[PDB]
Design a protein around this ligand. Structure first.
Ligand code: FA1
Ligand code: FA1
Ligand code: FA1
Ligand code: FA1
Ligand code: FA1
Ligand code: FA1
Ligand code: FA1
Ligand code: FA1
Ligand code: FA1
Ligand code: FA1
Ligand code: FA1
Ligand code: FA1
Lengths: 141, 141, 139, 141, 141, 137, 141, 141, 141, 141, 141, 141
């Protein structure tokens, strides 16, 4: 059972700066953490990160075609991209929107998400653990 | 450690009505589910519900005095109540805001929350499992 | 059958003074019960300044599949809790306002109930409640 | 005592389309039903319908000049006509604004009315019976 | 010469938290300072606090029936409660809206009050002394 | 301590037209209450924004507190706000009328977010209530 | 030459019911005044009034083809008619918008005009004499 | 098949007193061009224009009863008429909204249409050829 | 009877720039025109210009104490000054707001006036002749 | 004459979902249809699709350099990209914006386009036929 | 070649109250810096400050008549003054708007400028060096 | 001492067409001017341009990891890109935002920038010299 975990722009640099806002973990540490939690639940997690909106669209496309669930932290494109929203709306399996930081306690523009209205559900502010709680929801649904 | 799970107006009726929106589980079964998960996790779950703002405020106050964390589904008061937000901001232990339904796929006025800017984090649209995921985050701190 | 008339905060002091007419709350319960007997209905007329109490009355009506005529006072404009309790009614809900809320302060022009109500009557004074009965008498 | 019942554009076709929104009663049938209820109340009803704003303005002018009350379902002109509002503000007898459908459960632009601030009262969402109820109000003054 | 001083939700806990916004004086201390100033001024002050909306309305109804002035710090109901405003609008004697904190220098939502337009006057930002100044006004009036 | 009471535009004509207290009368009341509180009140009025700014600059330099009724400039003047922001002693914004029961435009104030506190609609006594707060620090 | 004076809906009832929001002068009396004042200025005024938008459009069309000035009191259509603003935008000669009452001292919706951005100029609040002054502007070109 | 092409206010004046914002083609030349295209397409076009909203409504009621498609350029009433929108919402055959000018390159208010949300589709800015393209859509369905 | 004509900031420089729609007339030539016309009417005009807000307020205070009328072109302050509005709001005689240019055909910020709602009337876009029309109005009251 | 038909993100997947919203025609079959209609018209169509914004900008830069027309369905970038609008605004030949779906009958965010104000004109809701009607306008200019 | 540097209200107090904003340089010191840099560049700088709007207007009127450029830091009047804006629009030589602090990083009202749309360009946030950069642009014309 | 100058989409085509907006200088020429003034100043300028947001993000990451300053003309992404803003907010060295044209003099959407609030300073409207002025600020830190 495959679960795609997809990270958007700038998330490749997790841990290098403001560990107050996004955690101390780097992206390789995140990938290993998610893979371990996913094996413990009976799932396989494919974890991918890209700064390129076209590349993220490609991965969502493949997820739609294989009818696989998506855990998406779209970074900045969360608030700006209709193209990514429409590609995510093709997913027949669940879609969990994840934000490491509490986007409601930050700038006003971070409060609006193209993704939330079409997601199965949203987890915000729970730090890197939010990804792990999303997998666990997909294990039980 | 004690975790408080507080439910706001109307959630006493959980399970009888709009089962595609809220669960099929009743509040009684909900309380049981939470307690069992909390037990597994090394925690103790104190799960209470009320339709009165004054009573919710009283329980939040108690949690603040006790330095205990709160998992709050405020129901309609989420969107309307400054008095509740202000009492919640007194918590020193974590506050997770939970909604059973995906408040972002619903009427616009449900997209606005007084609680979210002052919560540690927010979990929405993951049905009743959002409560159990919130327990799991607090297990980790 | 039974029709529930539910009045919200401040409405206990009807006709008292210190817009809404000179009829008191006692006199209105009597009016509604007279008119409803005449229509062949049983009217239960209840008032509470407590939101939680209003909800419990709504919940009861919804369990018994009975109609509600609701003047929710200030909470018309402010309570999502109450809207959601009323959205559970399977029998009709008629939202009533004694005053013409459209001829007053701008904030009184927004109701959380109207979108989920069967219909709404506004500005016709106390008779508003009687017209709602007459509507419910025809179903 | 004459009461003037006035219907705006498109309502000549009542009963024929959107019966789920505007009822299955035709406009001839409405006129009869209203005339009957008026007589039972001790009133005489003059029911008229035009798709023409100039026409509806004329009939309002006559009602103002005879000091007769008006029951008005102005149809789409509810939302758009300042001219109709002003003609109506001249009236010294009462003005009751009626809508068949519940205009607050429908498109956002139907929630705004130039007539409501200047009317004695408003009835909405009670079907055709909404006209009978306004007649009952007027018999009582 | 009776003055009612009425405190709304959360204010039973004054001085216990956020002492930089609301002060270090407790509610019981505040009762005593208000009582002492009211005596100096030739007034009898009745100081009451509640978390319950319905209870505040009853207190205001009694002030209405006895033509007594009210000094009101409605706390969070300031910005949300029309029922509270309506009850206050029946007062024939002066009404003083008081806030301890400078509500204009805090969150945007605290900058709107249902009470101010119908109050005699408003004092904000002058701490606990705001209530004492409102007493002095009423002794003058 | 010296406390500066500053009145903005049009306030020189108080008492003419609707309280009945004139500006001379107002100065006199303020000075009395100030002395009863152990303070020396300096009360000035100007229709000129530049002059108002100068008075505020001087209170900042002398670390004195200001009671300010800015009149119509309350709702309009960023330059006045910034001058007041420089004050290290408390600033109290006072309005004679209840600005919240009037036109919408009067419900916005450039001064309130930077003031220590605001007193509105208590008439001329607001100036004396603001004196009393200042006397207590 | 010829100057067109066009009044829109409700304005044929000037004088009766009414003001003075709009004066005590009647529409016949207004016609006489304008004609007289126009005579004195060496102009011929043609004064016409209609509650029909299509009829007012027709009169503007005639003025556009005759290359004649227009003094326009559009009534409620001032605030609502794009079609009237488009007819008037065709005029090559001057267009003077006139309102009897001071539209800026009334309801907010009257403060908005489709005609003002395309008019040569606007006169508001000077009563009926408003028309006579526009004539005198037209006499000077 | 019969197709109705209905032009609303001021469009009788195509080509006379203004543009190209609108082309140099007169209404009669547009009628001839539309009839030639229709015939080439195997259809019969009926082209009607009015400055009167009531007349437009009558024509729309007829097309609805005749189950005939409509190409509508409602002119200024596009932006203003709820009554025209509702008459159009009843058409069972396609409705194509056409504007000669590019309404999106003009005033802000031209950018809102009551008709677009209930139209099959919309063509704007393509000049008079827009009508001939709408016809061609209808010949293919 | 004395009439005050008061021009605000930058107006001293009339006819230096840019001749539509401020005109080619200088401030000196405008004083002379206003004076002749005032005499023709049986009135005395006192025409004054200043770039100082305080100076304007003083001139307004004089007219208020002398129960004299004012024709005011506040220039930029029309849009920005509550002080100037409050000063004019004291005038017991008529106040006419004048603008040389059609402020409705210009920047959106020029369509808001603090003066218009308290003025007797308003004249816009009729050039320097606006001031003479204003005098004419005052001659008749 | 080369015409460029450019499709944006997700549109390579046409025909796979929401047929319904976008039709059953695949991208391959669309290219063939547009090629064949172009030939009928004496044009040569070059039909390209990409998920990459950078790639779209290069294709529009080439059309700007070669002075060739563009039919552009920008998909989600329609409502979000200034960069795309600016590159389009450089086009010297006609630019026709196409949407397969009726974007005004869908979410509010879809009713805003960066492209429309600088397009020659806009065709929406006519299905894939919209691309062929756009070719036909270009054949005439 | 003369260059007017004009400083608006409160800027006389530079240096002695907000090093973080604003900076440590006094007005006298800024004068000497600017004159020095200007000499380096072959310009003569005239640097002037006033808290009086009438005074600033007069200096802008003078630079207008002498066709000299202006570096303007209007302080608070930037956000509030139409009069200042209009005087500035008369300059034929370049007008450089300067702000010492980054006004986009501050309260939302400092983000609106009446001067930006009419300036040649604008420099913000580069501290006092902003004045010296503007001179360098003017030295290049 | 390295300074990176980074240009966004369409800016490769500088100088070619639109020279009254963006100058007649081409990109190659810009790079030569920038490198020459950086030498003059004791600095090394690395000047790059890309139409790809992913590439831009990578350039900004490398500047963050090297603690180098950035002068950024983001082009259209200025107004639209949160992902860009976030990458820029990692920069420990100064960030200068530069726009060639005066964005406040253009369309309203150009007056909003995601970069301004997190930049050190912003230069707009000063043409190509804007970049050289930003180089000079940075020389002086
Ligand atoms: O996971 C984060 O909280 C986020 O999604 C990442 C980068 C920012 O652009 C988002 O707004 C928040
Ligand atoms: O958990 C639910 O999704 C909710 O919190 C409950 C009741 C409603 O009032 C809230 O909007 C959503
Ligand atoms: O009965 C009505 O007029 C009302 O519901 C009663 C009290 C007020 O709070 C409502 O706005 C109106
Ligand atoms: O009868 C009413 O429901 C209505 O007035 C009739 C026609 C529509 O235009 C209104 O919005 C509702
Ligand atoms: O007195 C106080 O400042 C307040 O009234 C009390 C609690 C908060 O909820 C109000 O916003 C401010
Ligand atoms: O003191 C008064 O209430 C006020 O400050 C004076 C003049 C007006 O401009 C203010 O809005 C209120
Ligand atoms: O004459 C004017 O006052 C007006 O044009 C006439 C009738 C109303 O509908 C307008 O708002 C004002
Ligand atoms: O044909 C069009 O350009 C239009 O429909 C005609 C007249 C105007 O009122 C519309 O805004 C555009
Ligand atoms: O005469 C008028 O056009 C105006 O009063 C004069 C100067 C400008 O500042 C106003 O906006 C209009
Ligand atoms: O062709 C369509 O209708 C559209 O251009 C394509 C995809 C969506 O992102 C647009 O909103 C509509
Ligand atoms: O130069 C400064 O940044 C400013 O111009 C000075 C004073 C404040 O009023 C401005 O907002 C910014
Ligand atoms: O440098 C220019 O002024 C700009 O940064 C470049 C391209 C456009 O998209 C921006 O709005 C302005």
């Amino acid at each position: 059972l495959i679960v795609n975990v997809i990270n958007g722009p700038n998330l490749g640099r997790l841990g290098r700066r403001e560990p107050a806002v996004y955690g101390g973990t780097t992206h390789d540490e995140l990938v290993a953490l998610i893979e371990r939690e996913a094996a413990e639940l009976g799932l396989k997690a494919v974890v991918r990160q890209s700064d390129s909106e076209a590349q993220l669209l490609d991965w969502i496309h493949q997820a739609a075609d294989a009818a696989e669930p998506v855990i998406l932290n779209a970074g900045g494109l969360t608030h700006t991209s209709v193209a990514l929203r429409d590609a995510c709306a093709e997913l027949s399996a669940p879609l969990i929107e994840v934000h490491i930081s509490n986007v409601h306690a930050r700038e006003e523009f971070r409060r609006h998400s193209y993704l939330s209205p079409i997601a199965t559900g949203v987890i915000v502010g729970l730090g890197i653990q939010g990804y792990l709680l999303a997998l666990r929801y997909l294990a039980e649904h």
